[PDB]
Amino acid sequence: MEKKLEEVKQLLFRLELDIKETTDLLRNINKSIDQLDKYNYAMKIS
Amino acid sequence: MEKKLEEVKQLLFRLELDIKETTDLLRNINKSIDQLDKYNYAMK
Amino acid sequence: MEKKLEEVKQLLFRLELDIKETTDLLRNINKSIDQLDKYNYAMKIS
Amino acid sequence: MEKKLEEVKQLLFRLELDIKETTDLLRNINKSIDQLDKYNYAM
């Protein structure tokens, strides 16, 4: 079982990395949309 | 096996916290996107 | 920008579903760990 | 943003593969747990 638990641990590390890389990409996208927000605020509201 | 179970239990929980942060970010992005639609509605 | 955000919306939604599947999986793993703990503890106090 | 979204697509693909691989492993672990219980009545 301990062998199998180690296999689980290694897959959890993979999922953890998947989420890390995905979140980093989301932060990039988030900044992009924030810029679009500020642009459209200036254009349409102010 | 006790220690190994603890190892996995700890890692599971840390990953749950990470995923929570991802979910928060998703919420924020969706709110920013909704803000854009709001400008189209309100400007006009 | 329109269809660019459309694609964003599609990806965000796909990710939302994948996150749900991941969190469910993590709870399922935790259940298995909990059961293994029950057996291990039973051995320890025997 | 085009290329960043493509990278997101690739990460979702990898995530989904990894979810499936983990699900498959867990199924096998749960079978072992069932065997533990099968032979647990008499310690």
Residue of C9, C16, C30 lying closest to B9 (CB–CB):
C30
Question: Which technique was the structure solved with, according to the deposited record?
Answer: X-ray
Closest-approach residue (CA) in chain A for D25: A8
Task: Give D25: exposed, middle or buried? Use CB within 10 Å, 0-12, 13-18, 19+.
Answer: middle
Q: Cα(C35)–Cα(D18) distance, rounded to whole angstroms?
A: 24
Q: Cα(C3)–Cα(C41) distance, rounded to whole angstroms?
A: 56
Q: Quick check: C37 and B12 CB within 8 A?
A: no
Q: Cα(D5)–Cα(C4) distance, rounded to whole angstroms?
A: 9
Crossing angle, helix B2-43 and helix A2-44, to 10 degrees? 10
Q: Closest Cα partner for C3 from A22, D34, D11, D1? A: D1
Chain B environment of C26 (Cβ under 8 Å): 12, 15-16, 19
This structure's resolution (Å) is 1.6
Q: What is the nearest CA distance from B33 to chain C, expressed in angstroms?
A: 8
For chain D, say whether C35 makes contact (Cβ under 8 Å): yes
